[PDB]
Design an enzyme around this catalytic site. Structure first.
Site, PDB file in Angstrom:
ATOM      1  N   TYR A 189     -11.719  11.493   5.914  1.00  0.00           N
ATOM      2  CA  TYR A 189     -11.700  11.489   4.464  1.00  0.00           C
ATOM      3  C   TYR A 189     -12.751  12.432   3.922  1.00  0.00           C
ATOM      4  CZ  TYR A 189      -8.432   7.650   4.339  1.00  0.00           C
ATOM      5  OH  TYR A 189      -7.316   6.867   4.480  1.00  0.00           O
ATOM      6  N   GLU A 206      -4.483  14.426   5.130  1.00  0.00           N
ATOM      7  CA  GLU A 206      -5.013  13.700   3.992  1.00  0.00           C
ATOM      8  C   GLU A 206      -5.569  14.635   2.932  1.00  0.00           C
ATOM      9  OE1 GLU A 206      -4.692  11.085   2.701  1.00  0.00           O
ATOM     10  OE2 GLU A 206      -6.207  11.329   1.132  1.00  0.00           O
ATOM     11  N   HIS A 245       2.336  14.519   1.080  1.00  0.00           N
ATOM     12  CA  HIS A 245       2.540  14.223   2.486  1.00  0.00           C
ATOM     13  C   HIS A 245       3.959  14.584   2.894  1.00  0.00           C
ATOM     14  CE1 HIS A 245      -1.303  12.352   3.113  1.00  0.00           C
ATOM     15  NE2 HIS A 245      -1.080  11.385   2.243  1.00  0.00           N
ATOM     16  N   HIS A 252       0.851  -1.185   0.000  1.00  0.00           N
ATOM     17  CA  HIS A 252       0.000   0.000   0.000  1.00  0.00           C
ATOM     18  C   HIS A 252       0.889   1.238   0.000  1.00  0.00           C
ATOM     19  CE1 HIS A 252       0.386   0.085   4.541  1.00  0.00           C
ATOM     20  NE2 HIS A 252       0.412   1.380   4.286  1.00  0.00           N
ATOM     21  N   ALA A 253       0.804   2.026  -1.070  1.00  0.00           N
ATOM     22  CA  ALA A 253       1.642   3.211  -1.195  1.00  0.00           C
ATOM     23  C   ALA A 253       1.330   4.204  -0.085  1.00  0.00           C
ATOM     24  CB  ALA A 253       1.444   3.859  -2.563  1.00  0.00           C
ATOM     25  N   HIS A 299       0.657  12.791  -4.846  1.00  0.00           N
ATOM     26  CA  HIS A 299      -0.019  12.677  -3.564  1.00  0.00           C
ATOM     27  C   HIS A 299       0.976  12.328  -2.471  1.00  0.00           C
ATOM     28  CE1 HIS A 299      -3.311  11.667  -0.716  1.00  0.00           C
ATOM     29  NE2 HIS A 299      -2.415  10.802  -0.279  1.00  0.00           N
ATOM     30  N   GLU A 300       1.815  11.318  -2.706  1.00  0.00           N
ATOM     31  CA  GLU A 300       2.782  10.946  -1.683  1.00  0.00           C
ATOM     32  C   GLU A 300       3.729  12.097  -1.389  1.00  0.00           C
ATOM     33  OE1 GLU A 300       2.617   8.521   0.169  1.00  0.00           O
ATOM     34  OE2 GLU A 300       1.083   7.352  -0.867  1.00  0.00           O
ATOM     35  N   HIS A 323     -12.343  -0.771   7.776  1.00  0.00           N
ATOM     36  CA  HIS A 323     -12.156   0.247   8.802  1.00  0.00           C
ATOM     37  C   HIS A 323     -13.064   0.082  10.010  1.00  0.00           C
ATOM     38  CE1 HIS A 323      -9.268   2.797   6.659  1.00  0.00           C
ATOM     39  NE2 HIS A 323      -9.834   2.283   5.584  1.00  0.00           N
TER      40      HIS A 323
END
Ligand SMILES: *[C@@H]1O[C@H](CO)[C@@H](O[C@@H]2O[C@H](CO)[C@@H](O[C@@H]3O[C@H](CO[C@H]4O[C@H](CO)[C@@H](O)[C@H](O)[C@@H]4O)[C@@H](O)[C@H](O)[C@@H]3O)[C@H](O)[C@H]2NC(C)=O)[C@H](O)[C@H]1NC(C)=O
Ligand SMILES: *[C@@H]1O[C@H](CO)[C@@H](O[C@@H]2O[C@H](CO)[C@@H](O)[C@H](O)[C@H]2NC(C)=O)[C@H](O)[C@H]1NC(C)=O
Ligand SMILES: *[C@@H]1O[C@H](CO)[C@@H](O[C@@H]2O[C@H](CO)[C@@H](O)[C@H](O)[C@H]2NC(C)=O)[C@H](O)[C@H]1NC(C)=O
Ligand SMILES: *[C@@H]1O[C@H](CO)[C@@H](O)[C@H](O)[C@H]1NC(C)=O
Ligand SMILES: *[C@@H]1O[C@H](CO)[C@@H](O)[C@H](O)[C@H]1NC(C)=O
Ligand SMILES: [Cl-]
EC number: 3.4.15.1
Length: 585
Positions: A483, A371, A347, A313-314, A343-344, A473
């Protein structure tokens, strides 16, 4: 209070070493699955357990309400939450015991055909949901997973609720629902969330009806009532939380490509490092901190070939050492990962610019921001302008339809994911509230599935079933409303950057690139980390202290019009007043 000053000093000095240690193993195992690394990790888990409890018990001895250094106030208030550790050891022991039983049950549940052929949740069953157009097999897959995985979780859920409620109370909350809702640091959250949702209803209802019409011509009236809610097992996803898998059945315009960006990236020699390198360039043009040199030697940008096994999971990782930051992604050279990459990096960029705070505040302004920033810097990537700017597409005819195609694909996740993400935490909140009990868990779930997503189950269900167990979840006890916050506020930021960058006209044509002021506008916001109520940063970015959906409605404004118009061409009626219909047998 001077001791309180000292306390925060030692807390940082010790905690940095404990979390960095934790991260060091935690990273090492996530990349190197070798079983002994797990053993090493588990002992480190004891240390954080020792550390969390040791300084947490001390933290509860300070009375925060009399303090006036604002930083220390938020620091201590955070640390005083002992979470599971407020439970008696016996129940804490009992609590962990239950969590693993739930986690294990879900982790090994599988759906098997009558011949005994057994399919797992991912990627196997997920391929089914994404690709099958057979009403029968989809129902079997959806129904089966909920039958073996879903029903079993009632083996633990009730006591789980009681226990985390016990923990929450011992941490000073009314119930577990109070505990999570408190992290948005704003008492009127549900009231704000409620309004935010209503303002999307005109858009979502139009989108909903249009998807229904698409289903109508493929599944037929015998399974699609143009005048009722949609069968929740056709949305292309095991949970119907994201509808992007059915874009092919819903596309407003074919002739979408001027080029295949996947083939294009291959033609230009794009590589994982080069992809992430392009992101840094975009980030550098935005004047943010360049990535530290050690990153390029310790991140893992490709699937390893040395026989190490990876948790693919990235995600992004921070080692709290002001120097080690890393991204872990099984990077495939395609447009999808290009968005993943930005996106990464989003962060990572966020981590770097709050590096100056003590560990205790090294978090986003609120759980959503972290997020949320992840998306904004990526949004422009897939706009036609930016896609073209890197020659990922050779010049295309300037149709809006290509804009519309992109916006819908965006909406088919950005929008559909909203109500689902809303419903889960509402269902849990009221279950933690004790207002909802097991005797009607299923009715409250589906009733909310109707009210918020316009869904009804494909077939009737009675007690002995516990459908919520079907979504990771929940049994993993991880919140979702963050989210929702992420998919709202990310549009305010995009408006703010575009407004500051001076861009005018249709908002989706805006491109942050090289805006020396826009970047600084975010930078000053990011450096606040978690030291402030998110309203300060929200204002510092956008000019408002409240969350507002209006930015989002304007962003999708063109798609609304086209979709709304389509409803007239087909005379489609919005809404779902006729609650009870389901596909015919
Ligand atoms: C994934 O993680 C694994 C654990 O970190 C890595 O496996 C290690 O790989 C090394 C070789 O690179 C193996 O080396 C062997 O080690 C044994 C025992 O070494 C221990 O004892 C000596 C003293 O006798 C000490 O100096 C060492 O530091 C060790 O404490 C030797 O007997 C062999 O001759 C050989 O040197 C490790 O055994 C091995 N450990 C484990 C737990 O598997 C793996 O390489 C990692 N993957 C990557 C890509 O880095
Ligand atoms: C509140 O307390 C924090 C925590 O100590 C203070 O932070 C210090 O700030 C000075 C500069 O102002 C730094 O040189 C120190 O290293 C900081 N110490 C720590 C432990 O972070 C902060 O100054 C105080 N703020 C107010 C307004 O009183
Ligand atoms: C168990 O039975 C099912 C049903 O016959 C098999 O599923 C079929 O698998 C083939 C490919 O293997 C597909 O072309 C069909 O579309 C599938 N049918 C359905 C209804 O899904 C399954 O392969 C069998 N497994 C074993 C191990 O015998
Ligand atoms: C850490 O927790 C374990 C749990 O058994 C305990 O035995 C140990 O003494 C703790 N460490 C310290 C320093 O108290
Ligand atoms: C990364 O490590 C290699 C050796 O494995 C070295 O040649 C290279 O210079 C290093 N780069 C950085 C930035 O540390
Ligand atoms: Cl949260």
């Amino acid at each position: 209070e001077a001791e309180a000053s000292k306390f925060v000093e030692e807390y940082d000095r010790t905690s940095q070493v404990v979390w960095n240690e934790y991260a060091e193993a935690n990273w090492n195992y996530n990349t190197n699955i070798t079983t002994e690394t797990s053993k090493i990790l588990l002992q480190k888990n004891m240390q954080i357990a020792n550390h969390t409890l040791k300084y947490g018990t001390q933290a509860r001895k300070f009375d925060v309400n009399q303090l006036q250094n604002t930083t220390i106030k938020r620091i201590i208030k955070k640390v005083q939450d002992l979470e599971r550790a407020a439970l008696p050891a016996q129940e804490l022991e009992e609590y962990n015991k239950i969590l693993l039983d739930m986690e294990t049950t879900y982790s090994v549940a599988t759906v098997c055909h009558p011949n005994g052929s057994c399919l797992q949740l991912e990627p196997d069953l997920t391929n089914v949901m994404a690709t099958s157009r057979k009403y029968e097999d989809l129902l079997w897959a959806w129904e089966g997973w909920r039958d073996k995985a879903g029903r079993a979780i009632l083996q633990f859920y009730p006591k789980y609720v009681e226990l985390i409620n016990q923990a929450a109370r011992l941490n000073g909350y009314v119930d577990a629902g109070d505990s999570w809702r408190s992290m948005y640091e704003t008492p009127s959250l549900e009231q704000d969330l409620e309004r935010l949702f209503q303002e999307l209803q005109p858009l979502y209802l139009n989108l909903h009806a249009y998807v229904r019409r698409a289903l109508h011509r493929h599944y037929g009236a015998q399974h699609i009532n143009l005048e009722g809610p949609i069968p929740a097992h056709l949305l292309g996803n095991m949970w119907a939380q994201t509808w992007s898998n059915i874009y092919d059945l819903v596309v407003p315009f074919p002739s979408a490509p001027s080029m295949d960006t996947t083939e294009a990236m291959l033609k230009q020699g794009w590589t994982p490092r080069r992809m992430f390198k392009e992101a840094d360039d975009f980030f550098t043009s935005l004047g943010l901190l360049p990535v530290p040199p050690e990153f390029w030697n310790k991140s893992m940008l490709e699937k390893p070939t040395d026989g190490r096994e990876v948790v693919c999971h990235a995600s992004a990782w921070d080692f709290y050492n002001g120097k080690d930051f890393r991204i872990k992604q099984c990077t495939t050279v395609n447009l999808e990962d290009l968005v993943v990459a930005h996106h990464e990096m989003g962060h990572i960029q966020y981590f770097m610019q709050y590096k100056d705070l003590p560990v205790a505040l090294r978090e986003g302004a609120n759980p959503g921001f972290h997020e949320a920033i992840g998306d904004v810097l990526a949004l422009s990537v897939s706009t036609p302008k930016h896609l073209h700017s890197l020659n990922l597409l050779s010049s295309e005819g300037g149709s809006d339809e290509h804009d519309i195609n992109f916006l819908m694909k965006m909406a088919l996740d950005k929008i559909a994911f909203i109500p689902f993400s809303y419903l889960v935490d509402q269902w849990r909140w009221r279950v933690f509230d004790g207002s909802i009990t097991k005797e009607n868990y299923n009715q409250e779930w589906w009733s909310l599935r109707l009210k918020y997503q316009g869904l009804c189950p494909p077939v009737p269900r009675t007690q002995g079933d516990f459908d919520p167990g079907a979504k990771f979840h929940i049994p993993s006890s991880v919140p979702y409303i963050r989210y929702f916050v992420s998919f709202i506020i990310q549009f305010q930021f995009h408006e703010a950057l575009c407004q500051a960058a001076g861009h005018t006209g249709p908002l989706h044509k805006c491109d942050i690139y090289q805006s020396k002021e826009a970047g600084q506008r975010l930078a000053t916001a990011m450096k606040l980390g978690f030291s402030r109520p998110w309203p300060e940063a929200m204002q510092l970015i956008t000019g408002q202290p409240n969350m507002s959906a209006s930015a989002m409605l304007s962003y999708f404004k063109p798609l609304l019009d086209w979709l709304r118009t389509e409803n007239e061409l087909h005379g489609e009626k919005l809404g779902w007043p006729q609650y009870n219909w389901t596909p015919n047998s």
